[PDB]
Scaffold this active site. Structure first.
Site: not given
Ligand SMILES: Nc1ncnc2c1ncn2[C@@H]1O[C@H](COP(=O)(O)OP(=O)(O)O)[C@@H](O)[C@H]1O
Length: 520
Positions: A8, A68, A150, A173
């Protein structure tokens, strides 16, 4: 030939996963984290990727965030070299540094060289956007075996290809930078994105910013209009405190934003110790959250279905751990529970890993079943399979029966274990053998040997033979099965059922079973 890893490659974070012994496994970076910031920095002619780059994203002007977004485009990013000159980099190259990093630490964890991968993309992505992603992969020494969506990845992680029926699946998502809601039709292994809609400038980062506004407003209120917008070290600390606060409000009804020595004025040091309630945070972020509501209805109508017809909802993205998001999604699909049971920040990588395994050939699909698929039996006099744990019994379990000796004056017994539904143990698949001596000369039927087949809740088997008189007890522990391999043995018994029943006429299990010794 070799392993095909699942990547990913996300806007804000990246995750890498691989099939190990028939299961997807998420690999953790050198800082022990299961996801890695999609962030690259340059300092002293050294490329920095992930957490260490995120830790200087505001302070170091060279840091490249959200590359990205420029994928597919012809844009460039300029960064200073050590000597003051300017190097120019394509989004393929920057992403290739992130992919090289993930690839690097995966080889060190796996202990093999990796040169093949599946990389995921947003469903909306066009062919240039996908060819830039594929080119990133090539620059990083990875033969990109397939590019997948995705939300298609998300559906593979949830085994929705295995449903054997048409499935309408809503995938919500919400990432760190991007929001996407997609409607999938999954029928006979074909994945069709019926409709996609969302916002690639909306994500958990925007939620944090509202906390930065909150902390800012509070500082100005408390310190006569003190403004730290232009201070890079201050802003770096606020951004980090904002994200810590946000995450804690997904499990707490309040939190403390704690920033000692934020700066020093002629008054002395400015210390912030600020409460933020979940109620308040939700209020401040209501506008952001509500931009995700209409898109859900939009894609439902775009694919010409009622909400009724949606079979399953999957939550993807780490921001979907926020209560207000889970509640929103639920409100738009009455009846259905959104599925969050696979880490939403890992789920996409896991799907890629599955796809990787499937493209390879090693699809040794293990199944965490709560019930025993086949009969488990001990071989008794004549090669007869005396069952101890019947087919379809729920783990954990431990059944027991007392057996005896086939011959007079028999010094030991062979404890031959077998799996399958057939009356002879030679017909069934054997799982092990071991001996038990210590047995004193006696008539056949005298020695009382308590056998105990025992299964833990994780599945594996321990068989405990015990001579009750002499206390002598040897025991062996056993490995699991494939779906095709289960079905072959069921089929085999089904195929010889007439033959087997005539054998069964001569068998009588109601009397004490007898174990013999043939020399090893
Ligand atoms: N427990 C949580 N509560 C709220 N937000 C969260 C938590 N854990 C992770 N995040 C949020 O998830 C967001 C993105 O995670 P991710 O899915 O890895 O992003 P992407 O798929 O865009 O790379 C971040 O902005 C982070 O602050």
């Amino acid at each position: 030939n070799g392993l095909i890893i699942g990547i990913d490659l996300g806007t804000t974070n990246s995750c890498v996963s691989v099939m190990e012994g028939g299961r997807p496994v998420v690999l953790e970076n050198p800082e022990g984290k299961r996801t890695t910031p999609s962030i690259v920095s340059y300092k002293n002619n050294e490329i920095i990727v992930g957490d260490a780059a995120k830790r200087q994203m505001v302070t170091n002007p060279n840091t490249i965030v959200s590359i990205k977004r420029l994928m597919g485009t012809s844009n460039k990013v300029k960064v200073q070299n050590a000597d003051g000159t300017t190097k120019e980099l394509s989004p393929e190259q920057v992403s290739a540094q992130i992919l090289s990093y993930l690839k690097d630490f995966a080889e060190k964890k796996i202990g093999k060289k990796i040169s093949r991968a599946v990389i995921t993309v947003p469903a909306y992505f066009n062919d240039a956007e996908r060819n830039a992603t594929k080119t990133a992969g090539k620059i990083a020494g990875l033969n990109v075996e397939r590019i997948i969506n995705e939300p298609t990845a998300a559906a593979l992680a949830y085994g929705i290809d295995k449903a054997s029926r048409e499935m309408k699946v809503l995938v919500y998502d919400l990432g760190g930078g991007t929001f996407d809601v997609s409607l999938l039709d999954i029928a006979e292994g074909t994945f069709e994105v019926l409709a996609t809609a969302g916002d690639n400038r909306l994500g958990g980062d925007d939620w944090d910013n509202k906390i930065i506004e909150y902390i800012s407003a509070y500082i100005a209120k408390e310190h006569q209009g003190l403004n730290l917008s232009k201070d890079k070290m201050a802003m770096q600390r606020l951004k980090e405190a904002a994200e810590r606060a946000k995450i804690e409000l997904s499990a707490q009804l309040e939190t403390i934003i704690s920033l000692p020595f934020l700066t020093v004025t002629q008054k002395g040091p400015v210390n912030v110790e600020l409460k933020l309630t979940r109620a308040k945070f939700e209020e401040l972020t209501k506008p952001l959250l509500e931009r995700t509501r209409n898109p859900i209805s939009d894609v439902i109508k775009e694919a010409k279905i009622k909400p009724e017809e949606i079979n399953e909802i999957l939550l993807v993205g780490g921001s979907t751990r926020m209560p207000a998001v889970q509640k929103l999604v639920e409100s738009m699909v009455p009846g259905k529970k959104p599925n969050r049971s696979i880490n939403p920040d890992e789920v996409v990588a896991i799907g890629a890993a599955i796809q990787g395994g499937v493209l390879r050939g090693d699809v040794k699909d293990v199944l965490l079943l709560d019930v025993t698929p086949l009969t488990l039996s001990i071989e008794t006099l004549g090669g007869v399979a005396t069952p101890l744990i019947k087919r379809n019994t729920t783990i954990p379990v431990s059944k027991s029966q007392i057996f005896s000796t086939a011959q007079d004056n028999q010094e030991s017994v062979d404890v031959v274990v077998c799996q399958g539904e057939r009356p002879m143990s030679r017909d069934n698949k054997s799982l092990g053998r071991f001996n038990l001596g210590g047995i004193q000369p006696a008539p056949k039927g005298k020695p009382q040997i308590e056998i105990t087949f025992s299964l833990d809740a994780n599945g594996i088997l321990n068989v405990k033979a015990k001579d009750l008189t002499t206390q002598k007890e040897n025991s062996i522990t056993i490995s699991n099965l494939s779906e095709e391999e289960i079905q072959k043995m069921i089929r085999d018994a089904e195929a010889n059922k007439e033959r087997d029943n005539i054998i069964r006429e001569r068998i009588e299990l109601r009397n004490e079973g007898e174990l013999e010794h043939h020399h090893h």
